[PDB]
Amino acid sequence: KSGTWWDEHLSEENVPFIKQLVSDEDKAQLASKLCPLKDEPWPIHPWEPGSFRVGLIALKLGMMPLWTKDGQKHVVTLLQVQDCHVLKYTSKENCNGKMATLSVGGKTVSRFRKATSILEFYRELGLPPKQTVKIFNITDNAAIKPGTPLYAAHFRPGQYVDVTAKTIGKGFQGVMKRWGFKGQPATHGQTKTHRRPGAVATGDIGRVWPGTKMPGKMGNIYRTEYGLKVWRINTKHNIIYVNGSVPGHKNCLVKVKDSKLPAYKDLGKNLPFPTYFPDGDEEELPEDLYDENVCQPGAPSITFA
Amino acid sequence: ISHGRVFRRMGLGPESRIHLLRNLLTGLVRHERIEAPWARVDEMRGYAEKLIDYGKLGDTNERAMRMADFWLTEKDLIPKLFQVLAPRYKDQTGGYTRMLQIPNRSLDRAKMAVIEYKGNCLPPLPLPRRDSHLTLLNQLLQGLRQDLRQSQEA
Amino acid sequence: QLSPTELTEMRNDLFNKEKARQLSLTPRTEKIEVKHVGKTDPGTVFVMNKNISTPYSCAMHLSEWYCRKSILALVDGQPWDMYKPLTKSCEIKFLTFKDCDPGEVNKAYWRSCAMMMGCVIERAFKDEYMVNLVRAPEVPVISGAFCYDVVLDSKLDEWMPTKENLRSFTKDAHALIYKDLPFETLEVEAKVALEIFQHSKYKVDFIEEKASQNPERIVKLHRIGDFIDVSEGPLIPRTSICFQYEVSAVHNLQPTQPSLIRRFQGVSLPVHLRAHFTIWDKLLERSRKMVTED
Amino acid sequence: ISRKWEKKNKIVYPPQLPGEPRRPAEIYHCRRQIKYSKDKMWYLAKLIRGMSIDQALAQLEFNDKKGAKIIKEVLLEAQDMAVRDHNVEFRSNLYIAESTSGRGQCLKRIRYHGRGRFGIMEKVYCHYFVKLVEGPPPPPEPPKTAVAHAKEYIQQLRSRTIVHTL
Amino acid sequence: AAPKNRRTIEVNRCRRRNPQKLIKVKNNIDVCPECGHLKQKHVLCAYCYEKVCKETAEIRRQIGKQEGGPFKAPTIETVVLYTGETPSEQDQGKRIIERDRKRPSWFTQN
Amino acid sequence: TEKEFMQHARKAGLVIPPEKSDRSIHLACTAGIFDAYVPPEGDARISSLS
Amino acid sequence: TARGTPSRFLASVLHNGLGRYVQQLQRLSFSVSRDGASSRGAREFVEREVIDFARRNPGVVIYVNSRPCCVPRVVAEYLNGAVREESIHCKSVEEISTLVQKLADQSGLDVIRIRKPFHTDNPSIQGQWHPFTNKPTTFRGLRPREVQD
Ligand SMILES: [Mg+2]
Ligand SMILES: [Mg+2]
């Protein structure tokens, strides 16, 4: 009848033992999935036109300036992919939709703060619980066996991706901050009217139209940015350098996938399909994958023609 | 919008906020244990923590003397800080104070708290203690620890 | 021979007949001055009824906090069952799970769970098969699981329970916990217990050795629902005390040629010491390993 | 005024034959003229309604409302005379049956307003009533299950007749 | 703005007796292991905290009486001594406070 | 508005009627026995020896 | 109104009249004042009619109590336990006789709204209608759009 937490009845000699025990198990579980191509992988099919592959979940680290051989400066958001895995696969018929779906998670968190149903679901999967889970629409040939890890090498430089995340919340806000209303003049007789919405509707209808711009909560909603290209990829730290800014605050989880813009369709011909497998790769990728236009930090200073 | 704002708006303003914290700190120095509203105790805790760090610098350091002069309204406490508190915590690098929650005061049902310097001469507070190692849950986990310990060494 | 459904009926009738006899020989109403010795509310004196009142009744006199928390009663320094009637005026102390040294409480809980798990053994198997329990080893708490010694029919020589069979045992125990049967104790003469368990050779051996070590030659019998077992030492008041229950696995002792011994094992945790799902999972893995006494 | 609650403790039932079961003990207690709002005190009375005496005391001890301590003393003295004068064996074997608040006698004072206006303020007083019944609190009514909905719907369908005919 | 019509008691009951308007039952109440009085899990026990303050007040009263004047804070450590007690081997050069009482059981001597 | 309660009650028992009065309370019986009689020990056995 | 008044179905007492008719009136009690203008109609009624009424109805017991009163009353009891009390305050003789005769014919049931002007325990002799009453049966009773074997 009383609530409880994991370390409520633990003595002083037991708390460190439990903390390291779960930590060791979590690391062991994560390291056991480092060879997906040897643990009976699902069949791999060649890329075909009209095929959609799975995406990624990353953490927003920050931004740095980036220059090109042309001489222009572009800002890039640091998206780091950590502990990203495929959880479960749902076929097209089961998911009663036009395309099959795939479940992906990332950013493993403590097991002591998860529901019983979620904990047992991860127990059979043999992976630590993830913070967020996203669903990606894929085709039949793009199926990936559950438990397969994913890395930032799944994308390549010169590829346009889409990022979706919850925006920075701002709480209850007025019309000026929320909808950019012009407000009222601050002087010349104005009485208690400097940020008021003013008229909300016409008098004849005798009501307020639904969807009217009114003061209320702002942010903490899911927004997606389209047409963002990848300038650089760091193989060692699994970091993607997406162009421009992305929604969400620092250290927030952002779902990444291939761009849906019509002008960017049929561009996954050379991209890894269904994903990149470092264990089964014949060669080792370089430390950093740059763009053709990106000037390397170690390259000599650019002299224009 | 208050993101990253690590200072509470208390008192009549920034000047009053410092003065209120200073008075609480002075009483904490003199009496070694005071009770105050929970929010004010938490805010003052950081200033109390840093006082010993300035006290450890030595009285001959002119920066610490000026800081102690401002933050101690009663001048008799400055010799105490530089010759009692600082020598007591010379081996301790942090956590000089412990803060606990006490039942709300009857005047206005405000959230009350008590903050005191460790190693005081006052009678000990009824500090909350974790479960004993002899209980059923602890014994079962202890047995798991031993069996796991014997498994890895063999 | 006698069917199991009638064996329980006569054993219950004998238990009721003995309980009535103990009440009958007791006089009508006598007052015993029971003094409360403890760190909480000291100096309280309880004037209760001999062989009628219980340490639980004294607990209700103070508050429900004692009733809910006190798992064991300490009479004159020796452990006492919560529902066991008092026989004389004496000092009383109550013990909880979260005490400085809850060694007796843990041991009482350990034996209490053995009987509950031992009880569902008879009801689990088919009516055609025969099940005869041996005894309840006093396995230490630190072993990680409590064990009970059972012997099965000659048909199940190579039969080993699967996951579903162990799941069914847990479901029956949880229903037993759900029914919330209080633990009833009765101190009886050795000869009376012998005729109660005359159909079990192992229980007869257990009764005769318990009487041998006891100068008065009397043994204590505990009853849950319609089930009566010979247990040594006080138990917890009711079956609702335990919250998390599970039987770990089944192990076969050696040698098996003279007699087949099956050591069923399980682990439990009460409501007051509820654990997280992850922590409980590790305890289940540890409890599955076989354990033997020193 | 009316003071029927106090007289409810003076009614005596005839002795019971052994055939009929035990009549549970009941105690009527009330405190009059409390400087509190009856609406505000209603929330505390409803909160501890139906719970055990000792559980109610624990809930009332840590409540920040002023009326909480008033009821706490009322419950405490109600438990005292129950064991002492009402043949109650166990003082913890009691549960709250009914707890409610009633409007007491109130004064009328003038509250000054601007422009020479005024408003009639009222110094609210209220009573608190409580009845304690010996025995464990009754179990709460379980939620009505889906099968209960199923049989009830069947009963309505089976209870319909041909109307406006023979 | 003024109300247009009088609100009925049926509407008022639906608002005043709303579930969120009711007082929520507290499930963080437990008995103190030492004195047996009720306390919260995250809050110090009222009985034990108050008895420490009274002893602290008595010692502080002895502090001021031996002090005998403001702005005279000692530059040495302080140790309180009860009846039938002597200075310890490590208790040297520190201000001694004499309490005309027996040392409490909970007041463990260092 | 100035209306208040009639709370003028002073605690009053029944101890002494006003003095210097010819009328006084008439007593029908004494408070206690004039001389205490100590029952001899063993009177229960004397009951058998009727 | 009907929504504010309880109703009942049309019925009799023990199927009265099925084999024989049993008079439902069982007892009559009359209160008459010797002096007083309010009892004059009641007084003259019993001088000339209560004798003839008694002979007409032998199964009904009539009690005539003469006590001081301001409102003469008559109380009628039936075998079902229903009790009816009617005042005789200042009425004539030809109208009390009609009033008294009316109580004799009454069955004693509550005079409230009757839901149905008819009642029968066997509304049908050929069977009540059911959805399959006018439904033909096909060969082997095959359901629509299904095949067998
Ligand atoms: Mg925010
Ligand atoms: Mg004026």
Ligand SMILES: [Zn+2]
């Ligand atoms: Zn305490």
